[PDB]
Amino acid sequence: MKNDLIRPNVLSVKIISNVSPEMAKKLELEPHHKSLGLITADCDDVTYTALDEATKAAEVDVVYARSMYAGAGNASTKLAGEVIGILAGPSPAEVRSGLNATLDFIDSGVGFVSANEDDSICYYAQCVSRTGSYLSKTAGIREGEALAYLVAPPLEAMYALDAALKAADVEMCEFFAPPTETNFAGALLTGSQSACKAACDAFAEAVQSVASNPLGF
Amino acid sequence: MKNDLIRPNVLSVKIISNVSPEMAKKLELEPHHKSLGLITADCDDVTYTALDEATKAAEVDVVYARSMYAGAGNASTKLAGEVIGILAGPSPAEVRSGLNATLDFIDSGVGFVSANEDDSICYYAQCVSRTGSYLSKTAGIREGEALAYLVAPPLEAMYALDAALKAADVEMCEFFAPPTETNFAGALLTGSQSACKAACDAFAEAVQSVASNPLG
Amino acid sequence: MKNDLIRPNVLSVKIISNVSPEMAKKLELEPHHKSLGLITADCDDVTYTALDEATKAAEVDVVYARSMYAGAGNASTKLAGEVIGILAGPSPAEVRSGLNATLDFIDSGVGFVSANEDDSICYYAQCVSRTGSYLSKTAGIREGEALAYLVAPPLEAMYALDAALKAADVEMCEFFAPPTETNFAGALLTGSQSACKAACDAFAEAVQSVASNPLGFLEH
Ligand SMILES: [Cl-]
Ligand code: NA
Ligand code: NA
DSSP states (O other): OTTOEEOOOEEEEEEESSOOHHHHHHTTOOTTOOEEEEEEESOHHHHHHHHHHHHHHSSOEEEEEEEOTTOGGGOSSTTTTTEEEEEEESSHHHHHHHHHHHHHHHTTTOOEEEOSTTSOSEEEEEEESSOOHHHHHHHTOOTTOOEEEEEEOHHHHHHHHHHHHHHSSOEEEEEEOSOOTTSOEEEEEESOHHHHHHHHHHHHHHHHHHHHOTTOO | OTTOEEOOOEEEEEEESSOOHHHHHHTTOOTTOOEEEEEEESOHHHHHHHHHHHTTSSSOEEEEEEEOTTOGGGOSSTTTTTEEEEEEESSHHHHHHHHHHHHHHHTTTOOEEEOSTTSOSEEEEEEESSOOHHHHHHHTOOTTOEEEEEEEOHHHHHHHHHHHHHHSSOEEEEEEOSOOTTSOEEEEEEEOHHHHHHHHHHHHHHHHHHHHSTTO | OTTOEEOOOEEEEEEESSOOHHHHHHTTOOTTOOEEEEEEESOHHHHHHHHHHHHHHSSOEEEEEEEOTTOGGGOSSTTTTTEEEEEEESSHHHHHHHHHHHHHHHTTTOOEEEOSTTSOSEEEEEEESSOOHHHHHHHTSOTTOEEEEEEEOHHHHHHHHHHHHHHSSOEEEEEEOSOOTTSOEEEEEEEOHHHHHHHHHHHHHHHHHHHTOTTGGGOO
16 A cells, blocks of 8 residues: 555575685675675665674675666566665674674565555655764765665656755765666765754655656656 | 567656756756656667657657666666667756657557567567667767667577678677667667668568577 | 576577568678577576587687576566577578587576475586686686586575685686576586596585575575
């Protein structure tokens, strides 16, 4: 239904001790990163937000994070979902803490929101009040600054990003040009917490406007 | 069934009147681009042809044109389809004129055509008699010159492109190396209108030939 | 079930005699690339291995080879599968021999293997004893050198690759970072034949290990 949360799910979790030199080199790991935590899930941008939160709760860095082509609904295998993330830390203890924090966030009630009856249009309008080390690096902002994390399907996102930019004193940090691997689009916007919230609200309203009247021009 | 039109459908259309500077930058718009026209549909190359047609009698530029991964049949949301296009113009009125032209073309009877009994193989063989500003730029020809816009699934397209090039006095301008985002392939060929027509006919026949004997 | 072969299937095969010069240029064909063999199939990495074999068996080069987005299961048309390969040679006969060698290999018993009961996790762990001209070029090794060709879905692959690198005296030549077009991941590793074989076995076991307990420590 409209305004329902689309529930995100974790599919697979694994820890590696004493990562191989070859893999460390290929992943451009820092010397302290001896352990890796792997995770996959069926919702990419929620998971990216979750991994960022994990960098606040534990001594881990996000060293790999990528989306799958055509989204979770089109996965051909059980554990692929639509995202893989890799946390790195000095030992399995730090990594375990980071994975647990990631899991907790994914199960916290955050998620994409449905814009219609059969949940075939949905969006993400998440105000991150304090970034961790991953989304702050992605956006090119100081760790701890706020972000509006806005994602919707391609036309909805372009229309709604424009509305969001006009509604608040925010800057465009990163543009996810359509298509992302999952055939969405969006942006990371920064500003005061107030400004990011205003942008989130305006984005949500604008996506809903297009969902309610897709051919109205 | 074979030779049936695969009807293209427009899914969403919206106009942005006074585009924000932040978006103008990320989209690399020109200073005279004040308004945007957004469109999505369930068939990309038809939409690209329609956008180009819109540039012919309206002051609009195609500033964004991208296809969706794995095509319209694999779309996960209702309005994504398999293409997004953005027109930019001096005003919302002129953008609307541009979109009106685009929509008219998409509904004109152009489209992908089925090559077999269950429509599981299809192709585009469109003679663009007179290009606009978009496809002429893409192919590297003069606005107003002709193109054969040829698209099919990957093996069929390679086989049929060779057939078209042998059949007609045309040059390859742009090659859509397999896979495009939709897992198709094709090319833009240029030449006289009669040569592009001869290319189109030969392409269609060759795609049909492969569909009829894919392992021979 | 676990250890079942996922049978690879060829969907289309065609020969172009005397390719038009216009095509020949865009495909980056060489003066002796006068004719083309085209093949599509529903399994990409087995086809890449097969095309590499063809370069040993016949006077052909692999001039084009790409995977389709989101894999064969999501193909929208009948013949797209998840891979297109193009062989080129001096004559239709050498291309014909090339394609015959490709087809022979694809039906040889090679393939992805299931890691679980419903075959929803699968992997490729192929020891190429002696590379042809295609995979050697891809890996940056000399033709004739051995490779472990390792592919699995993203988490399984990252885990099992790291396991294979620890298990055997191999080096990573090429990393297929997740996602490939098919939403898999893997690598080409080189070393002696026995070492590549050791990496393959280690890769396969590590993928099976994840498949048998996808949620790791959450499940203990
Ligand atoms: Cl674990
Ligand atoms: Na699908
Ligand atoms: Na079974």
